[PDB]
Amino acid sequence: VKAGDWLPGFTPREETVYVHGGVEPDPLTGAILPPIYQNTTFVQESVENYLSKGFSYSRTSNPTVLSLEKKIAEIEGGFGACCFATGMAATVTIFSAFLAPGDHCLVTNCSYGGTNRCARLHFSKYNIDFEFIDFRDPTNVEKAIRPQTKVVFSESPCNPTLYLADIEAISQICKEKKVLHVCDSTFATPYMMRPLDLGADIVVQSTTKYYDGHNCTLGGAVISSTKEIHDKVFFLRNVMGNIMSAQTAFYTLLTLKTLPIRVEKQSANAQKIAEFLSKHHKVEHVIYPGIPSFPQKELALKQHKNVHGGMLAFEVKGGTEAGIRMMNHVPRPWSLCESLGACESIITCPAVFTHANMLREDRLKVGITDGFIRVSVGIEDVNDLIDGLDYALSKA
Amino acid sequence: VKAGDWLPGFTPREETVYVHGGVEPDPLTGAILPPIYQNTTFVQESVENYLSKGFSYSRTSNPTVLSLEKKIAEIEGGFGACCFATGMAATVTIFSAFLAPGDHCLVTNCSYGGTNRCARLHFSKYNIDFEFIDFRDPTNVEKAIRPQTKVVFSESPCNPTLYLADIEAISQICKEKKVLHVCDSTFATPYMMRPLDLGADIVVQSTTKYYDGHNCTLGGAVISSTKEIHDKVFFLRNVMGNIMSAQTAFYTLLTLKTLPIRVEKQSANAQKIAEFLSKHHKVEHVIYPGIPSFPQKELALKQHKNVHGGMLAFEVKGGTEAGIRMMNHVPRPWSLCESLGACESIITCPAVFTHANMLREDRLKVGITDGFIRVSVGIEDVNDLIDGLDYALSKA
Amino acid sequence: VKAGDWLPGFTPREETVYVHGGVEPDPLTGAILPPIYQNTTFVQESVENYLSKGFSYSRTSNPTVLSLEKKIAEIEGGFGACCFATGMAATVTIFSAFLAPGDHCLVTNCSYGGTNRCARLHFSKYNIDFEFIDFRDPTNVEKAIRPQTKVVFSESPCNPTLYLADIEAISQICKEKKVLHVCDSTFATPYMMRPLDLGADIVVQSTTKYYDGHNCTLGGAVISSTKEIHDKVFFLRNVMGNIMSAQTAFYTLLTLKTLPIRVEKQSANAQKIAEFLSKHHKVEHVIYPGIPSFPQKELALKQHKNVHGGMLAFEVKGGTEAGIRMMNHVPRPWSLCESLGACESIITCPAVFTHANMLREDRLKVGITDGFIRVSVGIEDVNDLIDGLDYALSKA
Amino acid sequence: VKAGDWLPGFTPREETVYVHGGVEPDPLTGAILPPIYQNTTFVQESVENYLSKGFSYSRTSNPTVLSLEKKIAEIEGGFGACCFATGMAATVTIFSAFLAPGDHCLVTNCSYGGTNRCARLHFSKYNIDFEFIDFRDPTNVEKAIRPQTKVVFSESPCNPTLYLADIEAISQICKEKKVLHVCDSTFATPYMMRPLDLGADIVVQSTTKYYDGHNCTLGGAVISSTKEIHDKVFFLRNVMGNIMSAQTAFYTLLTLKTLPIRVEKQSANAQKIAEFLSKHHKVEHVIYPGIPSFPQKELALKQHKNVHGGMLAFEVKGGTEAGIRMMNHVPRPWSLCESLGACESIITCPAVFTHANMLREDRLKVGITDGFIRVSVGIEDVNDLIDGLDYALSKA
Numbered sequence A, B, C, D: 001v002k003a004g005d006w007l008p009g010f011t012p013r014e015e016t017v018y019v020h021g022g023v024e025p026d027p028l029t030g031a032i033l034p035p036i037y038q039n040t041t042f043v044q045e046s047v048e049n050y051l052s053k054g055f056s057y058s059r060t061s062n063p064t065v066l067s068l069e070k071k072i073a074e075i076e077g078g079f080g081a082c083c084f085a086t087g088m089a090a091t092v093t094i095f096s097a098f099l100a101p102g103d104h105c106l107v108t109n110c111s112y113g114g115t116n117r118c119a120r121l122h123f124s125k126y127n128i129d130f131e132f133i134d135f136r137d138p139t140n141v142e143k144a145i146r147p148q149t150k151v152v153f154s155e156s157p158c159n160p161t162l163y164l165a166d167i168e169a170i171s172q173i174c175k176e177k178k179v180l181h182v183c184d185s186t187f188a189t190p191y192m193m194r195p196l197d198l199g200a201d202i203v204v205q206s207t208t209k210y211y212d213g214h215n216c217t218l219g220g221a222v223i224s225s226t227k228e229i230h231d232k233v234f235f236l237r238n239v240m241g242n243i244m245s246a247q248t249a250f251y252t253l254l255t256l257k258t259l260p261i262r263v264e265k266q267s268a269n270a271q272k273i274a275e276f277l278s279k280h281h282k283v284e285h286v287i288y289p290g291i292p293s294f295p296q297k298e299l300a301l302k303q304h305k306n307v308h309g310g311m312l313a314f315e316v317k318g319g320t321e322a323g324i325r326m327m328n329h330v331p332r333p334w335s336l337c338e339s340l341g342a343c344e345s346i347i348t349c350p351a352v353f354t355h356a357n358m359l360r361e362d363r364l365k366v367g368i369t370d371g372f373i374r375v376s377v378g379i380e381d382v383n384d385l386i387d388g389l390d391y392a393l394s395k396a
């Protein structure tokens, strides 16, 4: 064993894989990072040796993108991964590949609003039936499975309510009933929960949020448990033309290196903020998987590794007017905007910013209430973050 | 009026629009190029003033991308444009938006292979009927339209045969039958043919090819004739998550500046190469709209502005074996690879690469003969290009 | 000879070198463009095989930068080239490497104001004597050479007056007197004049201007006639830490591909604009090397290949007030700003924007008069450019 | 006050400044990150309103670069900062601005090798006297100052020996003698030591190392204690043409966000590795400010905040041959290369690489013994790092 080689028979530990997974020094120059293959097409040696160097056209595959895919498959525990322009593109490619007219698809009723809308407003025109149900009890999923069910699509924690789904239990149900279990674990990250380890067949990630973690790029990933599934996704990505770009892949290769230390800091901050909010006399309810009152505490402790995440939610006393006054007065360092997962702490109101297309009776039915505030905790000093919330709450 | 203003009541001439369309100096700093908005999310001033500055999240819209879209809409003569991660993503968004189960779509039978395979594999599973016909006679289109026809999808010149479609005549037919006419004018560029000027309802572009012209980025664009069509495309792009990235849009904003002078040089080179090939004893047939043997020379003179383009094709005598010997010996500066439209001259044999997914019997049905070679002419010195072809032909 | 090889014993023609110089397809993947080596450090195989793959640290050399250097040395006709963060960095590295206290340096008195200021205001504190003289007559240079003269630094055409220097004649003088002849040919480009072909020992370029040509990047280059000179420049670049970045090198590799067609278009536009101005009743003087009244016409015809360039200058009748009114009313597509060489046409007034640090009596002495306007012609439609000048002149 | 404002009268705490210092949402669009001003020149509103929007030409200043400069000045506690293409460019600008013929400069004799060689080769030719002395005792500095001394240039910890300099004491000396105290605190980072807080007049940083922390960019910064010093640095940067690019500034704006959590992880790992090495029988000496054998432990406790850093050094028993056997067998995840500060752990032997330009007798004079190894600890799992060192040491 010489410089440049791993020790044989040793599995590198987890943080080492975030730093080095999928990437060795460039064979040509020794460059320690992946060179960015900002290029459309690849020259072939001869007609007979077509594809002998592995690449032909960047819509189909690109070397920088492939380095990130290998890293993501390692981190998530999958056979292979495919990277996409956005998280929505990853989700839509799953629905495109694995559903056909007449099929039934069970979706957590608290899915990300984008997942919910691409199903209802687009794929349902192909006579695909999406049924939205409560995934908090796995027996609900078992009882709701119909003869035409092809896909069970879980999300955990859920955007924006932070409901959990028992991924292991649901995977056992789907394995018995021979249906595909797809899990969107964007809010968890693989540092907290790897659905493939818990039996899911496919994971979808919006790499926009925590894999990037810097508000820099859009991106998506599909991580497949098997070669058969991986090849189906890969084929359809080339047809739909929604692959990630090499430059986005370079950025994500760099930011993934710090995902463990970022998520540790964000989650330590979020625990302290959730505790503060839970004691605050102008806060009605606080939702965080790590505080003792979390309704699905036992599942959180079973299914979360290391941390309980950077996301929390709360409701201000006084209804919508008080929620709005609070939002309008939250000072820097907080940012009032959509998205989540970043070094910069973000405060969002789902009624207006993310789930505005959902009927208010239905919003209330899922738990998106009037004073409901979604919080993405960043890596600022937690005392500045609490000071800003306390000011805004005093104004509410 | 003053420095920094266009004079009111004047319309810039063609080349000026390539340099300046869609862009003004940054209002904040005066930067002569738009900055790159390499950022996911946009801060809002208040819950009330939501979207008051025009942006919320870059999957939906991004300022750099919107500047490119405004330029492209100006160059193509449309109401608005949407930009995509690839040309295939643009095409697939048209099929996704405008077709539903039971609908019918007419597609030119010599389409780019990717258009053909996204139809035939994928969308056909939704009980959408795609019919491939010969667009060289508009009455074929008129006769094949059904009550269920929603889209007529032309391409001109066609990939790889360079057949022309009479866009004005087909538009007249489609207007009478109230069917959408979508035209893929990637091979023409708007400098040679603007389908919206000739009555098409939608234009699809692979910006990868000539708009980029440098083998640098992938990209697509959909240019809509009306607000109603544009809004449908924009909505579905947000759902499918296949928008162009800001960094790609910046590259294409830069490269579009030189499209007229690039296409003029490529086309002058192509005319000379086509004339050379038409006299060479190893060459069976040459296809170029600018030489007198072109079968649709009358339509080329009616429909082509400025140039006859950088693309040509030819058949080497001696069939497949001769074509392969030739390809294996084409020297630099030629590149043996997929793609087209670039400063670097590219050659390929579609029977063995791009359209090798098509049955040889069907290959011949669509004119891709055994010795057929697609040539994308770049901006090198034409004597190097001709000397290289002459050397390669000596090995056939 | 097979695909991927050049024909042996053939020198590729000039436009082919702009497209392909310094770049072959990536050996690892076949990528047709140079991958961007966005990376600081390079891993070594062993202590003994240090530098066996050619790279160690990007301040010293970087693979993308080296690909551009090889291309620039080919285009300019030099032994080697070194690329820098800016044109000023290239110039300052020359002064740093080849002058020491007690040395005399002859500088064209109409040098770029930055060259003039770094000499007067900085290197003169090291007791280096910069003497500014009229380079229009080579015998002036011969007569002004002193025992301590080490460097003769010409520029042609000169910024902003467009005076020419006879590079061949001056090189003969410097070769006889054993002094180094450095030529800044930024305004010419190697498509119009290659000083190394005319005997200069070093060329300095601001790649910012025409090599980029898109207002995108800053950059500089030093092209050396010999290995001894090249190695001295390379060594000092590593010490001064002013190398070009890989991303800037990637952009310049792409934009250099179109330098010939850009400069042809800009120069055809500039000829027409200079003719228009020379007939205009509110224009006092027009300076362009291609119009028949140019005072150094005979030298322009001897020393310029293909074109007479994109730069021109003129004076409006009515002195400074009229020049200012004209500038304030020049409409789009023109831009009022510093810099030059770009696809976007630029109008500058040197008194305020570039040579404001020069005493007004001295400005007048060099020819930077009151109504003096420097024009950089882009690739817009020339009729829009003339329309805009004619409007502004009517307002002046 | 309102969303988007800092509360007046409050100062953000340390980690918040790393996330948000120097940056506010884009005023035009609300973009949460500053856009990349990848552009050379800036349009002016009128000849009169020249520079009214703050920018003219990116060699002089660029908006993205200025945002980074504001962040860096906040983090380091300075009046202002200037950013450069590399750390060497920052250092060379100090020597260029503040020294003239006849002046004297005191430099720590264990400086980074590049500082030492830019002094000894290059600036000494201008009759500037550089004197290299041992900064571990401040009275050496006091005794060596001459009437001609203009600059005292410290480094702490030193590259590669990790000697400390007492920055507060040296500043007191320099204040008494009215000499500029410049401190290169690259190895410390501002999270561990801010020399401006301890009385230094100027700080030099290689942002390549920890500010970047990802082996992605080269860069430098000069942080000035006063407006007069800042203005001198800014003026000369424009003359030397060695400003940082906008794209580099964007990368560093992103990576600085995580400097506290990166340095905390690197330092925790380094403490454990130093303790492991201090017990290993093949290791002669270990140098780390956090272990009790550190010779300057009293100063380390006074001068180091939060951590003792990611850098350590050790000597392998058996001299040069043993060091080489060890280096040749250090396995992944270690990288054998130059540079330091990164997420990827780096090891090198300065006698054979970084300081092999120093005479072995002088190498030993400055403490770089034959078996001396400089170690830059990254953020991998410490057990992989320790297992790899243990394997390598078994080959020594």
Ligand SMILES: *Cc1c(COP(=O)(O)O)cnc(C)c1O
Pocket (backbone or CB within 6 Å): A086, A087, A088, A089, A112, A114, A155, A159, A184, A186, A187, A205, A206, A207, A208, A209, A218, A219, A220, B059, B241
């Ligand atoms: C944001 C998000 C998505 C969609 O990803 P994009 O990258 O925005 O297209 C999907 N799932 C969750 C849980 C998300 O937060």
Ligand SMILES: *Cc1c(COP(=O)(O)O)cnc(C)c1O
Pocket (backbone or CB within 6 Å): A059, A241, B086, B087, B088, B089, B112, B114, B155, B159, B184, B186, B187, B205, B206, B207, B208, B209, B218, B219, B220
């Ligand atoms: C290449 C091409 C496409 C597909 O565009 P991509 O950018 O490769 O996805 C569509 N139409 C034509 C005519 C094409 O040449």
Ligand SMILES: *Cc1c(COP(=O)(O)O)cnc(C)c1O
Pocket (backbone or CB within 6 Å): C086, C087, C088, C089, C112, C114, C155, C159, C184, C186, C187, C205, C206, C207, C208, C209, C218, C219, C220, D059, D241
């Ligand atoms: C602009 C210029 C320079 C300086 O180059 P920068 O890239 O701006 O540092 C040098 N010479 C001429 C003739 C120039 O126009």
Ligand SMILES: *Cc1c(COP(=O)(O)O)cnc(C)c1O
Pocket (backbone or CB within 6 Å): C059, C241, D086, D087, D088, D089, D112, D114, D155, D159, D184, D186, D187, D205, D206, D207, D208, D209, D218, D219, D220
């Ligand atoms: C690397 C380094 C430098 C030089 O900075 P570059 O960015 O490599 O030019 C200066 N000081 C120290 C302590 C350094 O480690």
Ligand SMILES: *C(CS)[C@H](N)C(=O)O
Pocket (backbone or CB within 6 Å): A114, A159, A338, A339, A340, A348, A353, A354, B057
């Ligand atoms: C989706 C809104 S388009 C976004 N990622 C969010 O949940 O804020």
Ligand SMILES: *C(CS)[C@H](N)C(=O)O
Pocket (backbone or CB within 6 Å): C114, C159, C338, C339, C340, C348, C353, C354, D057
């Ligand atoms: C130099 C001004 S800093 C610039 N390139 C010009 O001449 O406009």
